[PDB]
Design a protein around this ligand. Structure first.
Ligand SMILES: Nc1ncnc2c1ncn2[C@@H]1O[C@H](COP(=O)(O)OP(=O)(O)NP(=O)(O)O)[C@@H](O)[C@H]1O
Ligand SMILES: Nc1ncnc2c1ncn2[C@@H]1O[C@H](COP(=O)(O)OP(=O)(O)NP(=O)(O)O)[C@@H](O)[C@H]1O
Ligand SMILES: [Mg+2]
Ligand SMILES: [Mg+2]
Lengths: 398, 398
């Protein structure tokens, strides 16, 4: 029929929500940003509709930088900084460490029948990257060879700049990937990767120059995402947002930021969840939790493999384990459901998990057998005991 | 680098969880199937790890049939049946109504430099279908031109059979899309579409001949999915699973099936939620709810646009509206959070919603502005008042 059609990747990415989510403004459950009060960092909800695909432009590039930080963290040449910028609608992200290799790609050059270099494949070729054949134990968030191309397809203009210690490579990628300019290659001896772009705000439902509220909301969201990165990356990396350092290097700092308005001056339960055997034993999970009667439902913030995912059995592992102990102790005083006993918890979980699978390119949800945690991971009893004490005291008051 | 690679669609679909979910067995929260007790239909949880991509093979084909049912419901030639079969691991789904057009695809033929017909494009060409340029008011679940190809890529062998009144078209698509046999085309006046396939069970983590428990679990899951279809499709369509008619033509029947074990002989609150203007006015939402103290947490079953999605503002619309009334009525007696007053609700929501977006190919979550429901839809107050009365009686007891 006339309606039966074949689409290419770029046209498909511009009209289909499967890649990065809705391409218009919708209600985003739990949307948050960070707002600065005095010199205090405070995470607050953003109760306005926003475009999920727009936020994924930023996220895809950000997770690419923290993926690189993970890859070189045990190598001689490492990532020391991730600089994120957002000004006048221009978004940029730069990291040091080895750049994308500046070399001709023979297969791509043969397909295109012209000289095509690796950074053009990295940025303009769908289903292309270094994680197509990812190992079980690889804890990079990246896996599909898709994310950077999504960022390009939603850019009015974009500039990729990378240097591998020998040369510098600059390439203009404009008009939602319609116009790929030939690269400019020079000698350099510098080493970094920078992505700078202007998203297609108007197509995504925003004011052509962002409105004051849109700009403030988007700036707040990116800043919180940079703060989440700062708690995830290794000991040698500093995260910057609009040049200032991000002061949330630990899950304690994240938990305080998220509960400053709710429950200031509260106690922060901490745990380092370790595993007995490799590869899991290489990746301890950091956890901080606040327990308060002021919280009216269970909430978590997860940064897993650099990704701010919202659903996963890693959360349930903590919830069920805590509930088991709460039920026990509570019964001794009376002599309660899973949401009961967890309704007063705010918990932050940050770390790497080998072998997880994702539910889509957005990586909203990770997928795994629950028994991975039961067999391999141990939650410190001191954390469980003080969490249970705090929760039981609240239950006894009502 | 050596690791920098370019992948094609089918190799990508076989390695990457983004298309259909995890490609191995993982824990699936809320996994259910239907099991027959006496002659009663009873939906029970399946507490065993299962492969999400495997279930999506079935789901993609099923939603293709209910999409056709919706497309032909107001036309002279309509869909009168959807027959789903699962036996000896062989899965098949057949619907009547107009078949896939048996016609040469010039563009596809030019690309391939051989005769390629429309049903081969429909089943073997990624990013291809009749919904690439989807209208905002189109309530079909299909949108990406991807789902049928995922089913083929996870089949050891498959047979597409379609007839359009003029001809019949039979085509063998084998070895995870590696071997596409030329079609056999004959004169016919039959009109239907059938997909029959053997999934790659072993590759997805199952026993080569399915084990007794695996077979029983998978049959139960498909049967429940067929029962959900029976509540969704139009009045002129019968759904069959393994030749038996599916006896859940209403949200009442669905709600009774899901609450038979927990709360038999309970009252079923019903509502038909209508909207003031088109396109929403064309698609009333059917709702049934059971309220019981035996219910531990809030649960919903959603069939939206034929899709059994698990997250969406359509649920929150009902939750917030009910909570508002519960808060008022409760305060009058005392003179309570959102977790409260909704913790004892099991609710079934079935219907079509125009203009929704999805968060991925799996269509786990739909995306929409909350204000669509606030401005356009009204929940009948009789349903709100009897739901509120039932909930307040429970809260007053404890
Ligand atoms: N900041 C960076 N530094 C170094 N290499 C990078 C950087 N960003 C991207 N790359 C490379 O470019 C490739 C393509 O990136 P991308 O399209 O995001 O795919 P991916 O990160 O591998 N998987 P995904 O994001 O899940 O679709 C990556 O695999 C890396 O090889
Ligand atoms: N049972 C069927 N009867 C008639 N036409 C069908 C049937 N199944 C598939 N088709 C057609 O085949 C096309 C390709 O199917 P499919 O690949 O599932 O894409 P889709 O349903 O359009 N979108 P999606 O499922 O979101 O990836 C559809 O768009 C329909 O035109
Ligand atoms: Mg990436
Ligand atoms: Mg489909």
């Amino acid at each position: 029929m006339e309606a039966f059609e074949i689409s290419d990747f770029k046209e498909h990415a511009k009209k289909k929500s499967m890649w990065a989510g809705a391409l218009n403004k919708v209600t985003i459950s739990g949307l948050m940003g960070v707002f600065t009060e005095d010199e205090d960092l405070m995470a607050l909800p953003i109760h306005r509709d926003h475009c999920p695909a727009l936020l994924k432009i930023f996220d895809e590039i950000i997770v690419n930088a923290t993926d690189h930080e993970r890859a070189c963290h045990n190598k001689t040449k490492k990532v020391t900084y991730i600089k994120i910028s957002f000004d006048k609608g221009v978004f940029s992200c730069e990291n040091d460490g080895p750049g994308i290799p500046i070399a001709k790609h023979e297969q791509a050059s043969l397909i295109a029948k012209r000289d095509v270099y690796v950074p053009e494949v990295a940025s303009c070729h769908f289903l292309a990257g270094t994680n197509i054949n990812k190992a079980k134990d690889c804890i990079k968030g990246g896996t599909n060879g898709v994310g950077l191309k999504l960022a390009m397809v939603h850019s009015q203009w974009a500039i990729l700049t990378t240097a591998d210690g020998a040369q510098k490579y600059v390439q203009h990628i404009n008009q939602r990937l319609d116009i790929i300019e030939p690269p400019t290659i020079t000698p350099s001896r510098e080493m970094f990767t920078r992505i700078e772009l202007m998203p297609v705000y108007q197509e995504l439902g925003y004011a052509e120059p962002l409105s004051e509220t849109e700009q403030a909301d988007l700036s707040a969201w990116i800043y919180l995402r940079a703060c989440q990165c700062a708690a995830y990356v290794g000991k040698g990396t500093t995260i910057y947002y609009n040049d200032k350092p991000c002061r949330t290097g630990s899950v304690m700092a994240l938990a305080k930021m998220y509960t400053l308005l709710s429950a200031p001056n509260s106690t922060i339960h901490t745990a380092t969840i370790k595993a007995d055997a490799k590869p899991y034993s290489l990746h301890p999970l950091q956890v901080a939790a606040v327990v308060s009667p002021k919280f009216k439902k269970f909430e978590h913030v997860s940064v897993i493999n650099g990704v701010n995912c919202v659903k996963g059995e890693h959360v349930t592992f903590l919830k069920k384990t805590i509930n088991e102990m709460v039920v026990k102790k509570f019964q001794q005083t009376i002599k309660t459901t899973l949401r009961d006993s967890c309704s007063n918890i705010f918990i932050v979980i940050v770390g790497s998990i080998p072998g997880i699978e994702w539910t889509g390119q957005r990586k909203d949800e990770l997928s795994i057998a629950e028994n991975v945690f039961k067999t391999h991971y141990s939650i410190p009893s001191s954390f469980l005991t003080s969490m249970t004490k705090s929760i039981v005291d609240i239950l006894l008051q009502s």
